[PDB]
Amino acid sequence: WAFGYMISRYSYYPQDKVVELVDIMQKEGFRVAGVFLDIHYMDSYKLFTWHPYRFPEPKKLIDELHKRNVKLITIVDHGIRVDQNYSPFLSGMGKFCEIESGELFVGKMWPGTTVYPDFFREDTREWWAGLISEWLSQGVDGIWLDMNEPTDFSRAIEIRDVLSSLPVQFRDD
Amino acid sequence: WAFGYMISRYSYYPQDKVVELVDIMQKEGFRVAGVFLDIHYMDSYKLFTWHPYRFPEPKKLIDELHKRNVKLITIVDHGIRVDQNYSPFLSGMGKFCEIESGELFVGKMWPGTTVYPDFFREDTREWWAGLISEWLSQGVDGIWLDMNEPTDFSRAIEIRDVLSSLPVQFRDD
Numbered sequence A, B: 001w002a003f004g005y006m007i008s009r010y011s012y013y014p015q016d017k018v019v020e021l022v023d024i025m026q027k028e029g030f031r032v033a034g035v036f037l038d039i040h041y042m043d044s045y046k047l048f049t050w051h052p053y054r055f056p057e058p059k060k061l062i063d064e065l066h067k068r069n070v071k072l073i074t075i076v077d078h079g080i081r082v083d084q085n086y087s088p089f090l091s092g093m094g095k096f097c098e099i100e101s102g103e104l105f106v107g108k109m110w111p112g113t114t115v116y117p118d119f120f121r122e123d124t125r126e127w128w129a130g131l132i133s134e135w136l137s138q139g140v141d142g143i144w145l146d147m148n149e150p151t152d153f154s155r156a157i158e159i160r161d162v163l164s165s166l167p168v169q170f171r172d173d
Helices: A015-027 A058-067 A087-092 A122-136 A154-162 B015-027 B058-066 B087-092 B122-136 B154-162
Strands: A005-009 A032-037 A071-076 A106-109 A112-115 A142-145 B005-009 B032-037 B071-076 B106-109 B112-115 B142-145
Touching: A005 A015, A015 A032, A015 A058, A058 A071, A071 A122, A087 A122, A106 A154, A122 A142, B005 B015, B015 B032, B015 B058, B058 B071, B071 B122, B087 B122, B106 B154, B122 B142
Parallel strands: A005 A032, A032 A071, A071 A142, B005 B032, B032 B071, B071 B142
Antiparallel strands: A106 A112, B106 B112
16 A cells, blocks of 8 residues: 555645545545645644644544545654653653763754754664654554654754844855 | 033923023022033924923023023034925925935934035025024024034944844944
8 A cells, every 4th residue: 555646735634624635535536545644733843742723633533544445644753842841852851862062952843942862872762663653553554754864954043043134145055 | 601601411401400400500609601402402303493392481491591691502403304394394495405316315314314405505505594593583592503514324324224133343434
Protein backbone atom coordinates (compact mmCIF):
# COMPACT_ATOMS: atom_id res chain seq x y z
CA TRP A 1 0.00 0.00 0.00
CA ALA A 2 2.98 2.35 0.44
CA PHE A 3 3.21 2.46 -3.35
CA GLY A 4 -0.45 3.29 -3.79
CA TYR A 5 -2.03 6.64 -4.57
CA MET A 6 -1.55 9.06 -1.66
CA ILE A 7 -3.42 12.33 -1.21
CA SER A 8 -1.96 15.07 0.91
CA ARG A 9 -2.08 18.77 1.60
CA TYR A 10 -0.72 21.37 3.96
CA SER A 11 -3.13 20.76 5.43
CA TYR A 12 -6.38 18.77 5.46
CA TYR A 13 -8.63 19.62 8.42
CA PRO A 14 -10.69 19.49 10.52
CA GLN A 15 -11.07 15.70 10.86
CA ASP A 16 -14.56 15.60 9.33
CA LYS A 17 -13.26 17.28 6.16
CA VAL A 18 -10.58 14.61 5.88
CA VAL A 19 -13.19 11.86 5.79
CA GLU A 20 -15.48 13.87 3.51
CA LEU A 21 -12.69 14.24 0.96
CA VAL A 22 -11.80 10.55 1.10
CA ASP A 23 -15.46 9.68 0.50
CA ILE A 24 -15.75 11.91 -2.57
CA MET A 25 -12.49 10.51 -3.93
CA GLN A 26 -13.63 6.91 -3.48
CA LYS A 27 -17.16 7.61 -4.68
CA GLU A 28 -15.76 9.05 -7.91
CA GLY A 29 -13.50 6.08 -8.59
CA PHE A 30 -10.13 7.01 -7.12
CA ARG A 31 -8.41 4.27 -5.16
CA VAL A 32 -6.76 6.14 -2.29
CA ALA A 33 -4.16 4.13 -0.37
CA GLY A 34 -3.54 6.76 2.29
CA VAL A 35 -3.94 10.34 3.40
CA PHE A 36 -1.21 12.52 4.89
CA LEU A 37 -1.91 14.88 7.77
CA ASP A 38 0.31 17.99 7.83
CA ILE A 39 1.19 20.22 10.81
CA HIS A 40 -2.31 21.72 11.20
CA TYR A 41 -3.45 18.59 13.04
CA MET A 42 -1.19 19.33 15.99
CA ASP A 43 -1.98 21.54 18.94
CA SER A 44 0.20 24.65 18.42
CA TYR A 45 2.53 22.56 16.27
CA LYS A 46 3.45 20.45 19.31
CA LEU A 47 4.65 16.98 18.33
CA PHE A 48 2.48 14.04 19.37
CA THR A 49 -0.63 16.10 20.08
CA TRP A 50 -4.01 16.58 18.42
CA HIS A 51 -5.51 20.00 17.84
CA PRO A 52 -8.33 20.20 20.45
CA TYR A 53 -10.78 21.79 18.00
CA ARG A 54 -9.82 20.43 14.58
CA PHE A 55 -9.16 16.91 15.84
CA PRO A 56 -11.26 16.42 19.02
CA GLU A 57 -11.82 12.75 18.20
CA PRO A 58 -8.63 11.35 16.74
CA LYS A 59 -9.76 7.77 17.52
CA LYS A 60 -12.92 8.28 15.46
CA LEU A 61 -11.01 9.74 12.49
CA ILE A 62 -8.68 6.75 12.52
CA ASP A 63 -11.47 4.17 12.56
CA GLU A 64 -13.39 5.99 9.84
CA LEU A 65 -10.40 5.96 7.51
CA HIS A 66 -9.62 2.33 8.28
CA LYS A 67 -13.24 1.33 7.65
CA ARG A 68 -12.60 2.78 4.19
CA ASN A 69 -9.31 0.90 3.88
CA VAL A 70 -7.32 4.13 3.82
CA LYS A 71 -4.04 4.45 5.74
CA LEU A 72 -3.18 7.45 7.90
CA ILE A 73 0.28 9.02 7.72
CA THR A 74 1.06 11.84 10.16
CA ILE A 75 3.85 14.36 9.76
CA VAL A 76 6.33 14.54 12.63
CA ASP A 77 8.93 17.28 12.80
CA HIS A 78 12.11 17.27 14.88
CA GLY A 79 11.46 20.29 17.07
CA ILE A 80 10.50 19.89 20.71
CA ARG A 81 8.69 22.97 22.00
CA VAL A 82 10.38 24.60 25.02
CA ASP A 83 7.20 24.37 27.07
CA GLN A 84 6.98 23.90 30.85
CA ASN A 85 3.93 21.68 30.58
CA TYR A 86 4.74 19.86 27.37
CA SER A 87 5.43 16.21 28.21
CA PRO A 88 8.00 15.43 25.47
CA PHE A 89 10.07 18.42 26.58
CA LEU A 90 10.11 17.18 30.18
CA SER A 91 10.77 13.49 29.36
CA GLY A 92 13.37 14.35 26.72
CA MET A 93 15.37 16.53 29.10
CA GLY A 94 18.96 15.32 29.13
CA LYS A 95 18.79 14.00 25.57
CA PHE A 96 18.69 17.29 23.64
CA CYS A 97 21.41 18.92 21.51
CA GLU A 98 23.71 21.40 23.25
CA ILE A 99 26.10 24.13 22.15
CA GLU A 100 29.87 24.17 22.80
CA SER A 101 29.51 26.22 25.99
CA GLY A 102 27.26 23.62 27.63
CA GLU A 103 23.75 25.07 27.47
CA LEU A 104 20.98 23.46 25.44
CA PHE A 105 20.80 24.57 21.83
CA VAL A 106 17.60 26.61 21.81
CA GLY A 107 16.32 27.54 18.37
CA LYS A 108 13.17 28.33 16.44
CA MET A 109 10.83 26.04 14.51
CA TRP A 110 7.08 25.57 13.94
CA PRO A 111 6.28 25.26 17.70
CA GLY A 112 8.16 28.52 18.34
CA THR A 113 11.06 28.37 20.80
CA THR A 114 12.38 24.81 20.44
CA VAL A 115 15.16 22.38 21.35
CA TYR A 116 16.20 19.35 19.34
CA PRO A 117 16.83 15.73 20.27
CA ASP A 118 20.43 14.62 19.81
CA PHE A 119 19.66 11.60 17.63
CA PHE A 120 23.33 10.63 17.50
CA ARG A 121 22.85 9.28 21.03
CA GLU A 122 21.53 5.79 21.64
CA ASP A 123 19.44 6.82 24.64
CA THR A 124 17.87 9.69 22.66
CA ARG A 125 16.95 7.18 20.00
CA GLU A 126 15.26 4.85 22.50
CA TRP A 127 13.33 7.79 23.95
CA TRP A 128 12.17 8.81 20.48
CA ALA A 129 11.28 5.23 19.54
CA GLY A 130 9.04 5.16 22.60
CA LEU A 131 7.14 8.31 21.64
CA ILE A 132 6.81 7.08 18.05
CA SER A 133 5.59 3.66 19.21
CA GLU A 134 3.08 5.29 21.54
CA TRP A 135 1.95 7.52 18.66
CA LEU A 136 1.62 4.49 16.36
CA SER A 137 -0.47 2.58 18.90
CA GLN A 138 -3.48 4.84 18.21
CA GLY A 139 -3.66 3.30 14.77
CA VAL A 140 -1.48 5.76 12.86
CA ASP A 141 -0.06 3.86 9.88
CA GLY A 142 2.94 5.89 8.80
CA ILE A 143 5.38 8.57 9.87
CA TRP A 144 6.31 11.53 7.69
CA LEU A 145 9.60 13.02 8.91
CA ASP A 146 10.00 16.63 7.77
CA MET A 147 12.43 19.54 8.36
CA ASN A 148 15.05 16.99 9.43
CA GLU A 149 18.03 18.41 7.54
CA PRO A 150 18.04 19.45 10.40
CA THR A 151 16.52 22.88 9.86
CA ASP A 152 16.33 25.77 12.33
CA PHE A 153 14.92 29.27 11.87
CA SER A 154 16.49 31.19 14.76
CA ARG A 155 19.12 32.91 12.57
CA ALA A 156 16.64 33.84 9.81
CA ILE A 157 14.16 35.26 12.33
CA GLU A 158 16.97 37.09 14.12
CA ILE A 159 17.82 38.97 10.92
CA ARG A 160 14.18 39.94 10.36
CA ASP A 161 13.78 41.28 13.90
CA VAL A 162 16.78 43.58 13.52
CA LEU A 163 16.50 44.68 9.89
CA SER A 164 12.70 44.66 9.89
CA SER A 165 12.31 48.43 9.50
CA LEU A 166 14.61 48.66 6.46
CA PRO A 167 12.77 48.72 3.09
CA VAL A 168 15.43 46.52 1.49
CA GLN A 169 15.47 42.96 0.20
CA PHE A 170 17.37 40.35 2.18
CA ARG A 171 19.61 38.06 0.17
CA ASP A 172 18.04 34.62 0.35
CA ASP A 173 20.72 32.43 1.89
CA TRP B 1 14.84 99.54 29.02
CA ALA B 2 16.19 97.21 26.32
CA PHE B 3 19.43 97.07 28.31
CA GLY B 4 17.67 96.25 31.56
CA TYR B 5 17.39 92.88 33.27
CA MET B 6 15.28 90.47 31.20
CA ILE B 7 13.83 87.21 32.46
CA SER B 8 12.90 84.48 30.03
CA ARG B 9 12.28 80.78 29.71
CA TYR B 10 11.12 78.20 27.22
CA SER B 11 8.54 78.81 28.36
CA TYR B 12 6.64 80.79 31.01
CA TYR B 13 2.92 79.96 31.13
CA PRO B 14 0.02 80.09 31.62
CA GLN B 15 -0.52 83.86 31.73
CA ASP B 16 -1.22 83.96 35.47
CA LYS B 17 2.11 82.26 36.22
CA VAL B 18 3.88 84.96 34.21
CA VAL B 19 2.46 87.69 36.42
CA GLU B 20 3.01 85.66 39.59
CA LEU B 21 6.70 85.28 38.78
CA VAL B 22 7.11 88.97 37.98
CA ASP B 23 5.51 89.84 41.32
CA ILE B 24 7.83 87.59 43.31
CA MET B 25 10.83 88.99 41.45
CA GLN B 26 9.82 92.59 42.14
CA LYS B 27 8.77 91.88 45.71
CA GLU B 28 12.20 90.42 46.41
CA GLY B 29 14.06 93.41 44.97
CA PHE B 30 14.79 92.48 41.37
CA ARG B 31 14.21 95.23 38.84
CA VAL B 32 12.80 93.38 35.83
CA ALA B 33 12.73 95.40 32.61
CA GLY B 34 10.92 92.80 30.55
CA VAL B 35 9.64 89.25 30.22
CA PHE B 36 10.11 87.06 27.15
CA LEU B 37 7.34 84.70 26.03
CA ASP B 38 8.56 81.61 24.16
CA ILE B 39 6.61 79.38 21.72
CA HIS B 40 4.29 77.87 24.35
CA TYR B 41 2.15 81.02 24.22
CA MET B 42 1.02 80.32 20.68
CA ASP B 43 -1.84 78.10 19.61
CA SER B 44 -0.18 75.01 18.13
CA TYR B 45 2.94 77.10 17.48
CA LYS B 46 1.00 79.21 14.98
CA LEU B 47 2.49 82.67 14.58
CA PHE B 48 0.38 85.60 15.75
CA THR B 49 -2.00 83.55 17.89
CA TRP B 50 -2.59 83.07 21.60
CA HIS B 51 -2.98 79.63 23.13
CA PRO B 52 -6.73 79.44 23.94
CA TYR B 53 -6.15 77.84 27.36
CA ARG B 54 -2.79 79.18 28.56
CA PHE B 55 -3.43 82.71 27.30
CA PRO B 56 -7.26 83.24 27.36
CA GLU B 57 -7.04 86.97 28.03
CA PRO B 58 -3.86 88.38 26.50
CA LYS B 59 -4.85 92.02 26.98
CA LYS B 60 -5.32 91.35 30.70
CA LEU B 61 -1.75 90.01 30.86
CA ILE B 62 -0.40 92.99 28.96
CA ASP B 63 -2.13 95.50 31.22
CA GLU B 64 -0.96 93.64 34.31
CA LEU B 65 2.66 93.76 33.13
CA HIS B 66 2.51 97.37 32.02
CA LYS B 67 1.06 98.58 35.31
CA ARG B 68 4.03 96.78 36.90
CA ASN B 69 6.30 98.69 34.52
CA VAL B 70 7.47 95.50 32.81
CA LYS B 71 7.85 95.11 29.03
CA LEU B 72 6.53 92.14 27.05
CA ILE B 73 8.67 90.58 24.30
CA THR B 74 7.11 87.77 22.23
CA ILE B 75 9.03 85.25 20.17
CA VAL B 76 8.11 85.08 16.50
CA ASP B 77 9.48 82.36 14.26
CA HIS B 78 9.59 82.39 10.46
CA GLY B 79 7.43 79.36 9.73
CA ILE B 80 3.90 79.80 8.41
CA ARG B 81 1.79 76.72 9.13
CA VAL B 82 0.29 75.12 5.99
CA ASP B 83 -3.22 75.32 7.43
CA GLN B 84 -6.44 75.83 5.43
CA ASN B 85 -7.97 78.04 8.08
CA TYR B 86 -4.86 79.85 9.28
CA SER B 87 -5.14 83.51 8.26
CA PRO B 88 -1.41 84.27 7.74
CA PHE B 89 -1.16 81.30 5.40
CA LEU B 90 -4.06 82.56 3.29
CA SER B 91 -3.00 86.23 3.26
CA GLY B 92 0.64 85.36 2.64
CA MET B 93 -0.15 83.21 -0.38
CA GLY B 94 1.90 84.41 -3.33
CA LYS B 95 4.71 85.73 -1.14
CA PHE B 96 6.23 82.43 0.04
CA CYS B 97 9.51 80.79 -0.96
CA GLU B 98 9.43 78.33 -3.86
CA ILE B 99 11.70 75.61 -5.20
CA GLU B 100 13.40 75.44 -8.62
CA SER B 101 10.51 73.54 -10.20
CA GLY B 102 7.89 76.15 -9.31
CA GLU B 103 6.01 74.70 -6.34
CA LEU B 104 6.06 76.28 -2.91
CA PHE B 105 8.91 75.14 -0.68
CA VAL B 106 7.08 73.08 1.94
CA GLY B 107 9.14 72.13 4.96
CA LYS B 108 8.90 71.34 8.65
CA MET B 109 9.15 73.60 11.68
CA TRP B 110 7.45 74.06 15.06
CA PRO B 111 3.91 74.39 13.54
CA GLY B 112 4.46 71.14 11.64
CA THR B 113 4.13 71.31 7.85
CA THR B 114 5.19 74.86 7.00
CA VAL B 115 6.04 77.32 4.23
CA TYR B 116 8.29 80.34 4.55
CA PRO B 117 7.90 83.97 3.51
CA ASP B 118 10.37 85.07 0.84
CA PHE B 119 11.72 88.10 2.74
CA PHE B 120 13.94 89.06 -0.19
CA ARG B 121 10.82 90.47 -1.86
CA GLU B 122 9.45 93.92 -1.01
CA ASP B 123 5.81 92.82 -1.01
CA THR B 124 6.59 89.97 1.38
CA ARG B 125 8.31 92.46 3.69
CA GLU B 126 5.33 94.82 3.49
CA TRP B 127 2.97 91.93 4.24
CA TRP B 128 5.12 90.87 7.22
CA ALA B 129 5.39 94.43 8.55
CA GLY B 130 1.60 94.57 8.51
CA LEU B 131 1.34 91.45 10.66
CA ILE B 132 4.05 92.67 13.05
CA SER B 133 2.37 96.05 13.35
CA GLU B 134 -0.99 94.45 14.13
CA TRP B 135 0.68 92.13 16.64
CA LEU B 136 2.38 95.15 18.25
CA SER B 137 -0.89 97.07 18.51
CA GLN B 138 -2.07 94.79 21.36
CA GLY B 139 0.65 96.32 23.49
CA VAL B 140 3.46 93.86 22.81
CA ASP B 141 6.72 95.76 23.37
CA GLY B 142 9.31 93.72 21.51
CA ILE B 143 9.85 91.04 18.90
CA TRP B 144 12.16 88.08 19.37
CA LEU B 145 13.06 86.60 15.97
CA ASP B 146 14.21 82.99 16.28
CA MET B 147 15.10 80.08 13.94
CA ASN B 148 15.75 82.64 11.19
CA GLU B 149 19.01 81.22 9.85
CA PRO B 150 16.67 80.21 8.19
CA THR B 151 16.23 76.77 9.72
CA ASP B 152 14.09 73.89 8.45
CA PHE B 153 13.65 70.38 9.84
CA SER B 154 12.18 68.48 6.89
CA ARG B 155 15.49 66.82 5.96
CA ALA B 156 16.31 65.71 9.50
CA ILE B 157 12.84 64.35 10.14
CA GLU B 158 13.07 62.53 6.83
CA ILE B 159 16.21 60.72 7.98
CA ARG B 160 14.50 59.73 11.26
CA ASP B 161 11.43 58.39 9.45
CA VAL B 162 13.47 56.10 7.23
CA LEU B 163 16.09 54.93 9.75
CA SER B 164 13.79 55.08 12.79
CA SER B 165 13.86 51.58 14.30
CA LEU B 166 17.51 51.06 13.37
CA PRO B 167 19.69 50.60 16.53
CA VAL B 168 22.22 53.02 15.08
CA GLN B 169 23.49 56.46 16.06
CA PHE B 170 22.99 59.25 13.50
CA ARG B 171 25.86 61.65 12.84
CA ASP B 172 24.85 65.14 13.90
CA ASP B 173 25.34 67.20 10.74
